[PDB]
A paper describes a structure:
BRR2 is responsible for the unwinding of U4/U6 di-small nuclear (sn) RNAs, an essential step for the conversion of a pre-catalytic spliceosome (B complex) to an activated spliceo­some. The ∼250 kDa enzyme is composed of an N-terminal auto-regulatory region of about 400 residues and tandem helicase cassettes, each comprising two RecA-like domains (RecA1 and RecA2), a winged-helix (WH) domain, a helical bundle (HB) or ratchet domain, a helix–loop–helix (HLH) domain and an immunoglobulin-like (IG) domain. Due to its essential role in each splicing event and its association with the genetically inherited visual deficiency retinitis pigmentosa, BRR2 is an interesting target for the development of small-molecule modulators.
Five compounds (24, 50, 76, 78 and 86) bound only to a single pocket, two fragments (26 and 34) bound at two pockets and two substances (18 and 39) bound at three pockets simultaneously. Compounds 24 and 50 again exhibited different binding poses. Compound 18 exhibited a third binding site, pocket 4, corresponding to the C-terminal ATP-binding site of hBRR2T1. Pockets 4, 5 and 6 were each only bound by one fragment. The position of compound 18 in pocket 4 directly overlaps with the observed position of ATP in the C-terminal ATP-binding site. Indeed, the sulfonyl group of compound 18 established interactions with key residues of ATP-binding motifs. A hydrogen bond is formed to Lys1356 of motif I (which usually contacts the β- and γ-phosphate of ATP), as well as van der Waals interactions with Gly1353, Gly1355 (part of the flexible phosphate-binding loop) and Asp1454 and Glu1455 of motif II (responsible for the coordination of magnesium and, in active helicase modules, for the activation of a water molecule for hydrolysis). Perhaps surprisingly, we did not detect binding of compound 18 to the N-terminal ATP-binding pocket. The C-terminal helicase cassette is inactive in ATP hydrolysis, the motifs deviate from those of the N-terminal cassette and the pocket of the N-terminal cassette is probably more flexible to undergo frequent ATP hydrolysis cycles; this probably contributes to the lack of binding of compound 18 at the N-terminal site. Density for an additional molecule of compound 18 bound at two neighbouring hBRR2T1–hJab1ΔC complexes in the crystal lattice emerged during later stages of refinement; as it depended on the crystal packing, this binding site was excluded from further analysis.
Numbering used by the authors:
A (entry chain J): 2058 to 2320
B (entry chain B): 404 to 2127
The structure:
């Protein structure tokens, strides 16, 4: 029963610092990257993700907030059933642990015009058996706004953090799933109408035989999780040929530096 | 011996300068103690001076040497101690030690020493040779350093001496060091400078080092002084150039040991003056306080200071020294408050004196608030945290005796000359962040502060009051009364100090380290007082020199350095191996435990979090602790810092980390411990982080390199990159830059705005223009790349840097530095990096950088080129280099199979005379010669032979010649080799073969046209370098002997790819073109190293595939074992050090018994590597194993050598070879090597083409050399390396050859690609077109632009353009791509020729030669040279005008060996009779400018510089003749004849001296004085004399008069007659035809005698009709004369004036031979 006599004083213990410390060890997980192989019948397209940009993508991410990248690629000369992933494009974004917020404007750059869009890739805090209803809605809406996204040809790669590693699994939307996601407005974890017949496992392979590359915003950086107010679904942006800075880099959180100086 | 590992910590004096070695203390007579409540007082009275015994007068300045009297300007006498020291200081070079009480005049004795040194360098011109010496003045405190720069500069100004302090940056400061004669710096700065070993260091010039306050030896800093002195003395023996050492010491015990340490003769240069020599006597008061309780002791101290002050209030000024910045104010306020309470504030200030009003006004006008509170009462504070104007306020007001009580810091004691009658030292405790705690004041501080008591001419006594704690009394008493002995603190830094000597190569093993430690002051103290240093007296008597003790200390230090991976230490041998880590530790002044931590924790994956943590773990910070009382203010900072801190506030590393982060953010901390700790941490952050930067950059770690360079710039600029870069302009206002940061737009958003949109964006418009200026002041670079594939795996990159910002030396200084980083796909590896310096003189010019990077298949998407400022934050340009359209050359074809034919007997030649050439030297030919013989000897097909150096391709050429000699009795074979030294070797062998044996004619082209034509006619085998054949074969339309060539052999044709390749490509293309004109073909034979694109060379030269032998490197007849060893040291001198013992080990591993050549990069390295090989031999399993003949046989060879070191090394079996050796010295060494007498020879890289020895083992010691023009290291041309490797080849003696290449690791890959595989070569003709196009337009081979395109089709360039388009900047190989590219090249070349007035272009299609182009082509002179001649010359240019004009010709970019020789030529330039504007060394044209005047005035000598003189003389005659032609064409007579006689001057080596007798052999000035005395000034005069009268006039030898008479018989004696045809029938505007006839008389069959001129010459003459005073040059013809010759001259009459002309007959070779005949011609 102490008021004033046994006094104690609160010292702040801010959260992003612990997440920054743990993000500095992300590189450990890139030596243990597992693709789930539960797909069968080698039926559809086969997607080859180059290891070099996969590992960079993991290293620039956060263990809690999702990040996302647009996939661009091409078929090998005489193998139309294989889609090679040649480029990962990082656009201005923010995210939570369940979803990602991207602009409406898809990537637009001369270097990309000979490639075809193959979907997107996003980190995830935990493995899940099913594809997310958030993912199904996001893919669906991009598809309804952008006819260059063929539903038979664009995929979602989930990169799920397991303790010790990452697991990669690749899905695509079905026609049922497109039609559902594009009219869906419930952002919760179990919206009305959602179904496992809305998506389908596609086969995925990690390769060391060629290298991919990144494109990133021209005038800003990609990470707006510290500037969510300066982010906008309508925001426009250009691109340049360059490798993304990691999640907690100084240019993503300038207020921390300018506000520590004004202390 | 059985060594022991010591514990260094147990040997260390932990007290530092507070260690008191003496057990007892005796006070001056009259001292007395006095008790008081809580404290004791010791009083020591003032000492009486010695009463001027020894009849010592003060030396009047008048009695000094007259050159030293200016440094004493405005004094009447030297003081007393200067007077006792003047003989030793001024009249001798003895090393000095002077001990005197602080203030006695030691610094003035030091000035006298400096004056002696200065006097060593005054000439008769009165000036000082200020470039011939440096003087280092070492002073303990930076503030003292600046005060001395001031006082010394002002005293020495009248000499033109420059005194300066070394600033912190490193590249502008060496520029300053070059013009600084007296460098004033601290021990640590001189240590860090002389730690970096770079031979172009100016430390070579240092002649005198002054060590002021050398009693710092007792401080923790003292080991630095020990290291400096030891390094300086060992180096004096290393070079035998003396250095004078002067030590200035307080009067303390062990001064005799200090003098031993400085190599002072006690009897000659040791002077000890006791404390009675204090200029103002010192009553001293020591107050020692007994109270232990903080509160009571603090109050007692304030009490004692008040009482002491009151003893002086209104009678004396009192200077109180306290310990902090804040304490000055706290203490002054305490004292004056205690005065206020006791009504005593009035003793300090008289109410009726203007002093009070001055104080009130200056207070009210003052910026400082404490100075406001205090100045009215007469209390002042002074410290480092104040304004310069406020500090000068307090200084001026204290000197004016306005302030009565000045409380101040130690900075004032050191930096300002401000004495006070009374000084109080208030407490002797001080906080030391390094020690982590409160310590006692350093002894140097104490001495200096009490030295400030007593004003030298205002007071009769001074009063020093030291207030300390009682238990310290003895200490301070000892210190201030001559009794605190000076000890060595060396053990405390022994590992660090040892590593530096290992890094410098001064200590290569434990024996060296023992010797080195023998120069330490530690060593002398250990000998004189062993038990002080842990040595029992029995230990000493059993080890009298302390050999075993020093070996043990060295062993312990070595093992520490080895545990931490700075050195590899072999316990068995005692050897020490340097490392990159050790080098960085030494060069960045980092203690060895820190670099072990950095090595242990640095990883390429490190984030800013771990980077800050790694920094905070440095050992510099090991004593820092987290005090409970700071834990609160640190918590506040820990949970807001922008870089998260993993570990707890309980850890020192987290306080250190937070402190750095607060310093970058510029935060104000409140704890005083915290603020002092932050200062200590951040003051070393910079260089610690720069060491990290260098480690990770050299390891190639791109992410971490970027982060650490960044953190360096944040530390230096005190801001994060998040901040607007614009705040790096201090001149900008914080307000507006914060407005801009608040507006949150990209900084680059500002580049798109005029000055108005800038004001509008930032919501305030008044500043649009100023912001616009600063926006475009910020450094910014544009980048573009030309990608140039070499193979499918190696890519040459040419990077253009275009500056895109306004320069302004107020903000940029004189240079800006950047890093160029080439980074792979993922931005994780630095494929290539280098330093880039944008100099102000080039601020607007594009810069071109070239380098190689690896590539692979499948091609990666892109690389990146980052160019980053080395100092500006947010200052970077990154260029993606994409590979989406790169065109790779096709993979090269298989080599030609070596066929394993039966070895071919000489018998196959079926010709007894022919077989006589080879029969004695071998029975059979080698497999390659066997394979090619059938084609070369039994056919006429053009043939290509490609094979390694040492394959015997020269006998293949001989096969082709022998065939020629059977087809055509008078066959002409012309043989081109790309090097002159090679040409001379081939000429000496082919003379013997084809002239001595086969009785054919073999000639070597000299390069003079008239003689080379005769050689070409009369020779069957004609040997020439490419340029000498270019000059001849340009005129093939009018020279039948060039077309009548049966055989054209070209050797080392792979050098088409190299620096002088265009000329070689062109002459080969021309020989193909001629062979296709004359329709009787010239056979071509090409010899080459193994080429990957041999097929293209063969196609270009018309070789069928059946006659192209493209052999691979592995078919070398003597099998080659090639080893490439990588060395990961990026500092050249240290990398060479680390190669030194590997050189020896390679000799013993690959060639213990057989000959060895070591190629080293410099002349200097030949001798050092020879000696080091000898040193390593002497301590090995074999000694003298390299000498294979007895000592007796070697003696006649030793007699003839002038180099004595060469004779020592030759005795021990090792020779060397470099440019500076006389030619016969080199011959002696070469034959000793050939005969087997010596086993090893160390040659310089520059000799790798002219060596006529070979070896079983070649070692290439490093692959880079220093270019002094560009001040940078340059990679050996690959052609040089192949030529060096080719020296490991003895076909008659060895079963194999062996080669070890030692190189920087960053070069290993390149060599493995381009030595184990055949070489791809390319043309660079497209970069060397103009002078060849110009020749072909004179010669009418190009008459229009279409012609230039067809011409280009004949060349190697054109072939390679379709095979490797990207290399030549083509983007396709289609017919039209080629046509447009050819057209562009043609267009731009012809445009440049036209703009230079060398050619004309009519109808934009047709081209024609102009006057200038014709002169360029005839004299074989660069078209830009002839242009610059037209622009520089004048119708009345001086002879010296010519001298410079020709000196700036493009032909003269060749000598950069020594800048200091040109700094000596600054003095040489006064003597030369010719006068111009400025001397600027580091420019090959100025070396030419001066090395010519040296020739004409027969000035002095040198070795390599004389071989330079000879290559300038190889072009002077052509350049002079070109000027003569330019002047004649324009019409200007005067300078025409002036240049005609300048030809005479350069040939005969004499100026315009009227006496031509200097041309005669064996003649001297006295000979001319006597000849002129007897009436003889002409050569014809001496030969007209009766023989005996001449023999009496000149003192003569028989051979000497015979030489004179040879000259007089070759001297021209030409009789001339002129006939004017139609002498009386000529109308204006009509023909004046003058026929002149020339009769040599006597006889002529010999070249021009001219010993001073290297090349042989034939006499040439100009006949020139002109008119003087009008300068109307009319008609001139050039002629060569053989006894009789007649010539016509043409003129068109200018009027009917009917007047006179002068006629000139001018030699180009002899002076005095010039005739002048006057003739008048009336019109009609
Ligand atoms: N999924 C998983 C994998 C590993 S691993 N590949 O490091 O051994 C460790 C823990 C895990 O939960
Ligand atoms: N060149 C040089 C000069 C010196 S010193 N003490 O004379 O400045 C020491 C070492 C050196 O290698
Ligand atoms: N130019 C040249 C070439 C060769 S070799 N042995 O490669 O054919 C030997 C000596 C030489 O002077
Ligand atoms: N790995 C490495 C390489 C080099 S190198 N080969 O550039 O001189 C220097 C230092 C290093 O730590």
């Amino acid at each position: 029963g102490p008021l004033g006599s046994m006094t104690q004083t609160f010292s702040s213990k801010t959260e992003w610092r612990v997440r920054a410390i743990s993000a500095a060890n992300l590189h450990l997980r890139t030596n243990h990257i597992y693709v789930s192989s539960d797909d069968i019948k080698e039926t559809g397209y086969t997607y080859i993700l180059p290891k070099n940009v996969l590992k960079k993508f993991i290293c620039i991410s956060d263990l809690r907030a999702q990040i996302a990248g647009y996939l661009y690629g091409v078929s090998p000369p005489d193998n139309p059933q294989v889609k090679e992933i040649r480029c990962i494009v990082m656009v201005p974004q923010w995210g939570t642990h369940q979803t990602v917020h991207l602009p409406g404007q898809l990537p637009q750059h001369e270097y990309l015009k000979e490639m075809e869009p193959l979907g997107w890739i996003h980190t995830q805090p935990n493995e899940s058996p099913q594809l997310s209803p958030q993912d199904v809605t996001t893919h669906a809406k991009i598809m309804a706004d952008n006819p260059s996204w063929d539903g038979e040809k664009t995929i979602i790669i989930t990169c799920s953090f397991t303790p010790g590693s990452c697991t990669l699994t690749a899905y695509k939307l079905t026609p049922s799933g497109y039609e559902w996601g594009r009219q869906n407005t419930d952002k919760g974890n179990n919206p009305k109408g959602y179904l496992p017949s809305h998506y389908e496992r596609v086969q995925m392979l990690l390769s060391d035989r060629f290298l991919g590359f990144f494109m990133v915003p021209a005038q800003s950086s990609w990470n707006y999780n510290f500037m969510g107010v300066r982010h906008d679904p309508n925001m426009k942006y250009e691109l340049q040929l360059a490798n993304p800075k990691e999640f907690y880099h100084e240019v993503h959180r300038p207020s921390h530096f300018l506000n520590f100086a004004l202390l | 011996a059985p060594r022991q590992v010591l514990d260094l910590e147990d040997l260390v004096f932990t007290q530092g300068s507070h260690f008191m070695a003496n057990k007892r203390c005796q006070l001056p007579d009259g001292s007395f103690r006095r008790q008081r409540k809580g404290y004791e007082e010791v009083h020591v009275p003032a000492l009486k001076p010695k009463p001027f015994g020894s009849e010592e007068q003060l030396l009047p300045v008048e009695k000094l040497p007259k050159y030293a009297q200016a440094g004493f300007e405005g004094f009447k006498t030297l003081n007393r101690i200067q007077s006792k020291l003047y003989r030793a200081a001024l009249e001798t070079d003895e090393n000095l030690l002077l001990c005197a009480p602080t203030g006695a005049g030691k610094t003035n004795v030091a000035l006298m020493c400096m004056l002696r040194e200065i006097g060593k360098h005054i000439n008769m011109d009165g000036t000082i040779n200020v470039d011939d010496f440096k003087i280092i003045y070492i002073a303990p405190m930076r503030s003292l350093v600046q005060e001395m720069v001031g006082s010394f500069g002002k005293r020495l100004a009248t000499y033109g001496i420059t005194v300066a302090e070394l600033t912190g940056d490193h590249q502008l400061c060496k520029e300053e060091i070059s013009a600084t004669q007296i460098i004033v710096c601290t021990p640590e700065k001189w240590d860090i400078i002389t730690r970096k070993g770079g031979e172009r260091t100016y430390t070579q010039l240092v002649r005198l080092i002054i060590l002021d306050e050398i009693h710092l030896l007792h401080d923790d800093r003292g080991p630095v002084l020990e290291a400096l002195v030891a390094r300086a003395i060992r180096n004096i023996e290393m070079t035998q150039e003396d250095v004078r050492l002067i030590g200035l010491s307080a009067t303390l015990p062990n001064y005799e040991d200090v003098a031993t340490f400085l190599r002072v003769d006690p009897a000659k240069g040791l002077f000890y003056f006791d404390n009675s020599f204090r200029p103002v006597p010192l009553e001293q008061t020591y107050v020692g306080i007994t109270e232990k309780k903080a509160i009571k002791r603090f109050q007692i101290m304030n009490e004692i200071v008040y009482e002491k002050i009151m003893e002086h209030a209104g009678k004396n000024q009192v200077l109180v020294f306290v310990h902090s910045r804040k304490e000055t104010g706290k203490t002054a306020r305490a004292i004056r408050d205690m005065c206020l309470e006791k009504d005593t504030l009035g003793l300090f200030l008289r109410e009726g004196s203007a002093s009070t009003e001055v104080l009130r006004t200056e207070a009210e006008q003052c910026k400082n608030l404490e100075l406001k509170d205090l100045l009215p009462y007469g209390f002042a504070i002074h410290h480092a945290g104040m304004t310069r104007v406020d500090r000068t306020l307090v200084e001026d007001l204290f000197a004016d005796k306005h302030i009565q009580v000045l409380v101040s810091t130690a900075t004032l004691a050191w930096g300002v000359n401000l004495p006070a009658h009374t000084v109080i030292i208030k407490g002797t405790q001080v906080y030391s962040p390094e020690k982590g705690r409160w310590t006692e004041l350093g002894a140097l501080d104490i001495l200096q502060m009490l030295g400030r008591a007593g004003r030298p001419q205002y007071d009769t006594k001074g009063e020093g009051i030291l207030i300390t704690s009682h238990g310290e009394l003895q200490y301070y008493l000892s210190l201030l009364n001559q009794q605190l002995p000076i000890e060595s603190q060396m053990v405390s830094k022994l590992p660090d100090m040892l590593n530096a000597e290992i890094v410098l190569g001064n200590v290569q093993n434990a024996k060296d380290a023992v010797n080195w430690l023998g120069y330490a002051y530690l060593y002398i103290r250990m000998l004189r007082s062993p038990t002080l240093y842990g040595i029992s007296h029995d230990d000493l008597k059993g080890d009298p020199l302390l050999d075993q003790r020093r070996l043990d200390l060295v062993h312990t230090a070595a093992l520490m350095l080895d545990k931490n991976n700075l050195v590899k230490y072999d316990k068995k041998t005692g050897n020490f191996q340097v490392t990159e880590l050790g080098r960085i530790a030494s060069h960045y002044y980092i203690t060895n435990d820190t670099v072990q931590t950095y090595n242990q924790l640095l990883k390429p994956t490190l984030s800013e979090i771990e980077l800050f943590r790694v920094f905070s773990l440095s050992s510099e910070f090991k004593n820092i602790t987290v005090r409970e009382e700071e834990k609160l203010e640190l918590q506040k900072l820990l949970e807001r810092v922008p870089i998260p801190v993993k570990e707890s506030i309980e850890e020192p590393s987290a306080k250190i980390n937070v402190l750095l982060q607060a310093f970058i953010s510029q935060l104000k901390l409140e704890g005083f411990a915290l603020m002092a700790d932050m200062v200590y941490v951040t003051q070393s952050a910079g260089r610690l982080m720069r060491a990290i930067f260098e480690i990770v950059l050299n390891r190639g770690w791109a992410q971490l390199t970027d982060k650490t360079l960044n953190l360096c710039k944040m530390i230096d600029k005190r801001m994060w990159q998040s901040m607007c870069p614009l705040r790096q302009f201090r001149k900008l206002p914080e307000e507006v830059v914060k407005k801009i940061e608040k507006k949150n737009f990209p900084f680059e958003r500002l580049y798109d705005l005029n000055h108005n949109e800038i004001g509008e964006l930032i919501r305030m418009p008044k500043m649009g223009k100023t912001i616009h200026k600063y926006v475009h002041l910020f450094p910014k670079l544009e980048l573009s790349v030309h990608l140039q594939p070499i193979t499918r795996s190696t890519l040459k990159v040419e990077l253009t840097i275009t500056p895109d910002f306004q320069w302004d030396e107020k903000v940029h200084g004189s240079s800006e530095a950047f890093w160029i980083l080439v980074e792979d796909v993922d931005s994780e590896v630095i494929l290539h990096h280098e330093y880039f310096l944008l100099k102000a003189k080039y601020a607007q010019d594009e810069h071109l950088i070239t380098f190689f990077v690896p590539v692979f298949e499948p091609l990666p998407p892109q690389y990146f080129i980052r160019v980053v400022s080395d100092r500006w934050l947010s200052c970077e340009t990154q260029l993606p280099v994409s590979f989406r359209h790169l065109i790779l050359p096709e993979k090269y074809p298989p080599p030609t199979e070596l066929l394993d034919l039966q070895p071919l007997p000489v018998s196959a030649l079926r010709n007894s005379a022919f077989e006589s050439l080879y029969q004695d030297k071998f029975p059979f030919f080698n497999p390659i010669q066997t394979q090619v013989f059938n084609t070369v000897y039994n056919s006429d097909d053009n043939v290509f032979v490609g094979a390694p150096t040492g394959s015997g391709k020269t006998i293949c050429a001989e096969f082709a010649i022998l065939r020629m000699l059977l087809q055509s009795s008078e066959g002409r074979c012309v043989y081109i080799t790309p090097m002159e030294a090679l040409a001379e070797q081939v000429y000496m062998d082919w003379y013997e073969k084809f002239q001595d044996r086969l009785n054919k004619k073999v000639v070597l082209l000299t390069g003079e046209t008239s003689t080379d034509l005769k050689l070409l006619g009369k020779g069957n085998i004609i040997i020439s370098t490419p340029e000498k054949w270019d000059i001849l074969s340009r005129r093939w339309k009018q020279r039948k002997n060039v077309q009548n060539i049966n055989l054209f052999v070209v050797d080392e044709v792979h050098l088409i790819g190299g620096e002088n390749g265009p000329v070689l490509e062109v002459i080969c293309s021309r020989m193909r073109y001629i062979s296709s004109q004359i329709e009787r073909p010239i056979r071509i034979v090409a010899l080459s190293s193994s080429l990957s694109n041999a097929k293209d060379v063969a196609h270009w030269l018309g070789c069928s595939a059946t006659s192209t032998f493209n052999f691979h490197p592995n078919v070398r007849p003597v099998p080659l074992e090639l080893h490439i060893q990588g060395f990961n040291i990026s500092h050249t001198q240290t990398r060479l050090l680390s190669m030194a013992k590997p050189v020896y080990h390679a000799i013993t591993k690959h060639s213990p018994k057989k000959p060895v050549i070591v190629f080293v990069p410099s002349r200097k390295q030949t001798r050092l590597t020879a000696i080091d090989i000898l040193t390593t031999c002497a301590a090995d399993i074999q000694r003298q194993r390299f000498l294979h003949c007895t000592e007796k046989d070697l003696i006649p060879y030793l007699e003839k050598l002038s180099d004595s070191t060469l004779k020592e090394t030759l005795l021990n079996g090792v020779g060397y070879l470099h440019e500076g050796l006389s030619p016969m010295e080199r011959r002696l060494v070469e034959q000793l090597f050939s005969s087997g007498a010596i086993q090893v020879v160390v040659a310089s890289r520059s000799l790798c083409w002219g060596m006529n020895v070979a070896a079983h083992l070649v070692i290439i010691m490093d692959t880079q050399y220093y270019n002094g023009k560009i001040h940078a290291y340059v990679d050996y041309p690959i052609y040089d390396v192949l030529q060096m490797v080719g020296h490991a080849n003895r076909p008659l003696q060895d079963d194999e050859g062996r080669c070890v290449i030692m190189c920087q690791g960053s070069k290993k890959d390149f060599f493995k690609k381009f030595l184990y595989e055949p070489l791809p070569v390319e043309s660079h003709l497209d970069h060397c077109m103009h002078d060849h196009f110009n020749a072909e337009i004179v010669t009418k081979t190009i008459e229009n632009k279409q012609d230039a395109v067809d011409y280009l089709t004949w060349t190697f360039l054109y072939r390679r353009m379709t095979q490797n388009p990207n290399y030549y900047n083509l983007q396709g190989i289609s017919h039209r791509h080629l046509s447009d590219h050819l057209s562009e090249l043609v267009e731009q070349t012809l445009s440049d020729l036209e703009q230079s007035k060398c050619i004309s272009i009519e109808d934009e299609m047709d081209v024609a030669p102009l006057n200038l182009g014709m002169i360029a082509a005839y004299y074989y002179i660069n078209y830009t040279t002839i242009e610059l001649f037209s622009m520089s010359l004048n119708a009345k240019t001086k002879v010296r005008g010519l001298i410079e004009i020709i000196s700036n010709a493009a032909e003269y970019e060749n000598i950069p060996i020594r800048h200091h020789e040109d700094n000596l030529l600054r003095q040489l330039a006064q003597k030369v009779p010719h006068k111009l504007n400025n001397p600027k060394f580091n420019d090959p044209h100025v070396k030419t400018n001066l090395l010519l005047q040296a020739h004409l005035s027969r000035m002095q000598l040198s070795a390599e510089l004389q071989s330079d003189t000879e290559e300038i003389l190889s072009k002077a005659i052509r350049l002079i003749q070109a000027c003569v032609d330019v002047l004649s064409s324009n019409g200007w007579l005067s300078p025409a004849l002036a240049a005609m006689e300048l030809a005479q001057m350069v040939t005969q080596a004499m100026w315009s001296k009227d006496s031509y007798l200097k041309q005669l052999p064996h003649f001297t000035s006295e000979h001319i004085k006597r000849c002129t005395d007897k009436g003889v000034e002409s050569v014809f005069d001496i030969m007209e004399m009766e023989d005996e009268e001449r023999n009496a006039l000149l003192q003569l030898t028989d051979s000497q008069i015979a030489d004179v008479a040879r000259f007089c018989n070759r001297y021209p004696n030409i009789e001339l007659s002129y006939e004017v045809v139609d002498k009386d029938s000529i109308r204006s505007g009509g023909p004046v035809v003058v026929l002149v006839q020339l009769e040599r008389e006597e006889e002529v069959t010999g070249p021009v005698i001219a010993p001073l001129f290297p090349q042989k010459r034939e006499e040439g003459w100009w006949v020139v009709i002109g008119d003087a005073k009008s300068n109307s040059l009319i008609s001139i013809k050039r002629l060569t004369l053989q006894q009789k010759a007649k010539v016509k001259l043409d003129f068109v009459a200018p009027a009917t004036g009917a007047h006179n002309y002068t006629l000139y007959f001018m030699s180009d070779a002899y002076m005095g031979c010039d005739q002048e005949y006057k003739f008048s011609v009336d019109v009609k």
